Amino acid sequence: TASGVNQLVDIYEKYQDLYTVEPNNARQLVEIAARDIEKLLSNRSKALVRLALEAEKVQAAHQWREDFASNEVVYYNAKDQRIKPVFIEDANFGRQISYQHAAVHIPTDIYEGSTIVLNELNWTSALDEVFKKNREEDPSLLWQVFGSATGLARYYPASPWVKIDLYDVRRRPWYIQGAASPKDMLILVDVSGSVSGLTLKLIRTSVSEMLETLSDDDFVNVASFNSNAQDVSCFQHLVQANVRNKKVLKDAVNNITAKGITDYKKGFSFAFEQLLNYNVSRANCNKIIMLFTDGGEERAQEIFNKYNKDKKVRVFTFSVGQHNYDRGPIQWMACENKGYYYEIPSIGAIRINTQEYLDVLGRPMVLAGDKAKQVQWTNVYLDALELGLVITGTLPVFNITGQFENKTNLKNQLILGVMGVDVSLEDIKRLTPRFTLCPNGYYFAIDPNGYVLLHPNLQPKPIGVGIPTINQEPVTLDFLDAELENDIKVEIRNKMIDGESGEKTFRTLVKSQDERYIDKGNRTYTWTPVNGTDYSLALVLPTYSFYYIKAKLEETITQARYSETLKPDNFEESGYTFIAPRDYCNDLKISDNNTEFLLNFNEFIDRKNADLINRVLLDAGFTNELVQNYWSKQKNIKGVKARFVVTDGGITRVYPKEAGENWQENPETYEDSFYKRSLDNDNYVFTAPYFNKSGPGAYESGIMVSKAVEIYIQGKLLKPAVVGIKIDVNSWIENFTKTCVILDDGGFLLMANHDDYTNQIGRFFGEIDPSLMRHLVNISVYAFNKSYDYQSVCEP
Amino acid sequence: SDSSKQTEAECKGNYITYKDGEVDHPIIQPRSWENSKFDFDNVLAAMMALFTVSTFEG
Amino acid sequence: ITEQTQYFFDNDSKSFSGVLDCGNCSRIFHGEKLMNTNLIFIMVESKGTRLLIQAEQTSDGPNPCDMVKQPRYRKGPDVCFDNNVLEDYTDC
């Protein structure tokens, strides 16, 4: 009675006009969005290809000057002969841009003016005219970048570089991906007696500095040998080098100790055996054996004869530390097998060496001329210029000098660099418009590795691993770890990785947006591949979200009175109104402050997207008609502390206009936990306010009560609003006592007859009387699910 | 200064030292192609640097 | 890696009753769901151990040395450029 749940259903039903309940086809909706995303990742493929050919056709004619005392190369070094640029503050990138040249970032210890670098600043000065052509062809093209394999990156929209600059392009994920194909590394650390001391500190450092050059689609293991070959970790086969699997290997390498004689035969006979293990789902090429050692005598020729006779495995060898052992046998092993030999004398020589083997793995890529220039999108990572969550498309550029003279007996099998073009996720979340869906529905997409690009539970912060300690990885959330696992969402995931297109309706648990409640619900997972890439755009809809209210309104009078309806001065007699900040052409989003935005909104509709602004007005009037007709009449009902309504479209109203100051739920309706929670049930829901928060409440705010607003407008079910009240506890305390704990799912105390329990309202019932709950759980009431939230912060 | 640059022309600019050998905690220091304290370029510098040896100091 | 937990009703049964055996004593509870509402009403014999927690508490992830035994499904790429004959192996 107080809220007016059936006092609004009539209002929505009364205005049969001003509606058109249209259906979400859920198959023409995925395909029309999975074809827009494919178009986006294809425009960034033209910008790439057009960039590779221009940096390959200019390299060919450079002439290799060696005298820059005159004809000085001119460029804008990012950390500030040089260019003094003019910077325009562009809100798109969030920093200062110039648009008139390309910045250059020489790493912090590559000499800015050496000969090998001053040439690189010359023949890459012909890219500036195709960097400018690309965006001038299509704006909203964020970062072109040429990652030259001499340290340099020439990223186009020249911003000041973002405390020591350890950035080095040759290690960024978008480079090690373009520059080489998936690997099967196998590090053979040599933990024997002779590496005791400093040589071990460099081996443990350098190993953990090589596991950082491994993507998520290439496997790794870390053996070791001291007259018996074992594993440092507990794995016993190749383990994919995820964000997590690496941490097991890095933390097991760091806890290694030198002891015992050195035996190269028994330690290579263990490496070659773990590369033949073909029932582990390995990445089935670029087998490698990266031996770390100091120096020995035995070149185990009979091992490289039994195994690796036909030269399939590449033995890279590192002779790390300062010593005087024979580096002769080691050099033979890397030369006989198709490898290379690196020397790591001390720290500082670790970073520049462990990234070099990609120049070797990339040899069979250059020779495969244009079957190897294929765009390739990195898994989501955090941009290194404070842009947000981005994905980059990589495309190598080869060195065509002397080509068509058929000289090609040279350094013509190395790559100049990998060049990339960043796509931000906040640009993919704009090709999947969420507002013709219920708050529960959403799109998502996954890699062929399972990691979700574009998921609503993908927070823009680095993924976590392990409990922290007292004292460049990408954001890779697997699809089964962003949502509650069940034996049906495994089938969905396994059928999206294979690229199949289908549909599947089932009843599933859905975690509440505030990680406190779980809701059983019906969900229909539609998915379809994004042709021309390797992704699977899916779309999940509640079974009642198959229709949405698209408003038709052209009278300019009915919306006129709607316009002043939500003016801030009319708030006493029409509730304290909020609007969800949403995407309009030029209207400015909040500064975390809603009331500024509500003021902003009025001018832009006063002056003259179409649907979003058309729908918000219809809700404002439809809500206002309630808050004027019924909510105003029966003012100040006894048990009520506040009466609120929320709609899809933004309008959120509270009558007292004093309780509005105590309205904690954020103005975005599509993120309100209760609005999603109550939309899913077919009854009332009680959301216990948290216990012992930083902010006040739970006495002057009461406890929320909510109910959906179901409508059968033309025989079609809709739930387009949620009305509810904030019940004061004190009024409800007496009616309880006039009749012991009252309780809701999730075990949150609402009231107790005893008034020490009711003092700590909202606490988890089970931090109160745990002996009851553990027994109460075990009577097949109060189930519990235990998921992991890989993106969260801890103090130690 | 950078133990990995073995000539004049390659030893210019900055490089990354690590204090106490800790792998973290970098320090940016310049590269200096410096001769030894007591060198043998001249006969006179050779005599001075042989004197300090015959003193048993350094 | 915080480890969240959430609770909800298993059975749609409304009437609950039983006996506690916490220690050197016993208790009787009765519990009834407020029908057509997300609520549960229980009383137990007036008061006479270890805490349960619902807030997310820090924990190491799932045993990584065990999920690799039976890993998730995965499809790697297929370009796979390696092992070309016309390559100069004169570098070392």
Ligand SMILES: *[C@@H]1O[C@H](CO)[C@@H](O)[C@H](O)[C@H]1NC(C)=O
């Ligand atoms: C994908 O390609 C097929 C042709 O094989 C096409 O008919 C279909 O519309 C495409 N689907 C999407 C989502 O692009």
Ligand SMILES: *[C@@H]1O[C@H](CO)[C@@H](O)[C@H](O)[C@H]1NC(C)=O
């Ligand atoms: C893609 O490029 C074409 C080229 O003209 C342009 O018309 C289109 O708007 C672009 N679309 C996107 C999503 O960038």
Ligand SMILES: *[C@@H]1O[C@H](CO)[C@@H](O)[C@H](O)[C@H]1NC(C)=O
């Ligand atoms: C290379 O430098 C020379 C003189 O420094 C100049 O002739 C030439 O334009 C430069 N190359 C490019 C691509 O600008």
Ligand SMILES: *[C@@H]1O[C@H](CO)[C@@H](O)[C@H](O)[C@H]1NC(C)=O
């Ligand atoms: C380190 O390795 C030793 C080897 O016996 C083992 O006893 C110890 O538990 C390990 N510690 C850690 C933290 O891995």
Ligand SMILES: *[C@@H]1O[C@H](CO)[C@@H](O)[C@H](O)[C@H]1NC(C)=O
């Ligand atoms: C995998 O291969 C290993 C080594 O040959 C063998 O011991 C093991 O039984 C195999 N496992 C499976 C699942 O085939």
Ligand SMILES: *[C@@H]1O[C@H](CO)[C@@H](O)[C@H](O)[C@H]1NC(C)=O
């Ligand atoms: C490419 O190879 C040629 C010799 O064919 C060499 O002169 C040129 O410097 C190489 N490319 C780069 C970027 O150094």
Ligand SMILES: *[C@@H]1O[C@H](CO)[C@@H](O)[C@H](O)[C@H]1NC(C)=O
């Ligand atoms: C409330 O939280 C603070 C946080 O520091 C804590 O110190 C205090 O003991 C808590 N009080 C109750 C009653 O939970």
Ligand SMILES: *[C@@H]1O[C@H](CO)[C@@H](O)[C@H](O)[C@H]1NC(C)=O
């Ligand atoms: C959640 O708990 C229920 C009831 O115990 C169980 O049936 C289900 O498998 C659990 N689901 C998850 C994702 O743990």
